[PDB]
């Protein structure tokens, strides 16, 4: 590598894209953006593989410049845009809004949101930046440099932005009793409440999070993303609600649906 790479392999692409290894040699390289190449979902995957609007990549080429695609307020024309976490993709000609929340597994769930819920999004701050005139700042998880925050927004707070203006509405404290979105690693896709914070001078801290059905677990704070107060979230959840039942019960549930239908 005498510089930056431009390509990505079908075999080395992340598995949560669920790419058939038999179709093509390459993978659609995610363009650089507000989300890393690991946890992104390029728009070509969302149209062709998750919803099957287009069949080939060139059939996504005609539709992306048709200017019908609205990722979180903005209309993008590049199919390789890194649509990350909770990016609101609304499409006008069907009037259908979408939002990326994880499944019980690591993949992204195809979730239709209501238009009253499609106008706002929660974002986790990364750092409290102090601007050049005593002006406080924050960068969210999707690279939104927001100036003049509420001063009580610390490093692990979640904030609620309105996409029509790009401004905050309310914030959620990183405190015990809050809902959590475990985003990364072996616990990628779990939704539970905060139980206990374990401090670590020098390394990454860990917080233990119990699921709603008592399946308690732990994950470091880097993957932890609080979303709600008490026992109620601020967004609409897909089916399963992030509980991660073991593989013994999915076999029962799967046979239960085919024996009830016939």
């Amino acid at each position: 590598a005498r510089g930056p790479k431009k390509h990505l392999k079908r075999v080395a692409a992340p598995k949560h894209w669920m790419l058939d290894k038999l179709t093509g040699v390459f993978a659609p390289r995610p363009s650089t953006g507000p989300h890393k190449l690991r946890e992104c979902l390029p728009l070509i995957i969302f149209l062709r593989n998750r919803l099957k609007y287009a069949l080939t990549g060139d059939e996504v080429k005609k539709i992306c410049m048709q200017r019908f695609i609205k990722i979180d307020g903005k209309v993008r024309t590049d199919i390789t845009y890194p649509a990350g976490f909770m990016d609101v993709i609304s499409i006008d000609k069907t009037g259908e809004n979408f939002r990326l929340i994880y499944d019980t597994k690591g993949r992204f769930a195809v979730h239709r949101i209501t238009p009253e819920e499609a106008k706002y999004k929660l974002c986790k701050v990364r750092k409290i930046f102090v601007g050049t005139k005593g002006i406080p700042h924050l960068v969210t998880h999707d690279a939104r440099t927001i100036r003049y925050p509420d001063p009580l927004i610390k490093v692990n707070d979640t904030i609620q932005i309105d996409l029509e203006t790009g401004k905050i509405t309310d914030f959620i404290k990183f405190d015990t009793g809050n809902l959590c979105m475990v985003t990364g690693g072996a616990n990628l896709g779990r939704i539970g409440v905060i139980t206990n914070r374990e401090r670590h001078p020098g390394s990454f801290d860990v917080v233990h999070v119990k699921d709603a059905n008592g399946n308690s677990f732990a994950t470091r704070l880097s993957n932890i993303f609080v979303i709600g107060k008490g026992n109620k979230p601020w967004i609409s959840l897909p089916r399963g609600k992030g509980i991660r039942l073991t593989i013994a019960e999915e076999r029962d549930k799967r046979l239960a649906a085919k024996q009830s239908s016939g």
């Binding site: 005609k62 499409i91 069907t94």
Partner: protein
């Protein structure tokens, strides 16, 4: 006596067409050609047969079932808008280039040798 039914019918408000997966039941006889599929699907939706673009057929063993997939448009202007160029010529309505790919390149980098207006003059 070939009867055609529906599978996986969904609207394309994003693509100005409709798409449904074709199933064929042709007992005792061969795979029916794609031309006669269009008019049979035309009278099955009471629409015009010219924007019926079926392809991708695949027989199951022994015959009696062949499985394809096609697209039916809203109007002919979108059918000339969002479509691979070969599917136009599969009906024989559009004529592509008649130039061999080597003949394209053997002329192409031969225009790299001569600087000036003579780039259009080196070829023939």
């Amino acid at each position: 006596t070939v009867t055609i039914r529906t599978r996986k019918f969904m609207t394309n408000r994003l693509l100005q067409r409709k798409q449904m997966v074709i199933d064929v039941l042709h007992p005792g006889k061969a795979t029916v050609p794609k031309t006669e599929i269009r008019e049979k699907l035309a009278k099955m939706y009471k629409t015009t047969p010219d924007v019926i673009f079926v392809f991708g057929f695949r027989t199951h063993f022994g015959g009696g079932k062949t499985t394809g997939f096609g697209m039916i448009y809203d109007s002919l202007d979108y059918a000339k808008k969002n479509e691979p160029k070969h599917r136009l010529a599969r009906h024989g309505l559009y004529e592509k280039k008649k130039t061999s790919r080597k003949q394209r390149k053997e002329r192409k980098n031969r225009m790299k040798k001569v600087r000036g207006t003579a780039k259009a003059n080196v070829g023939a």
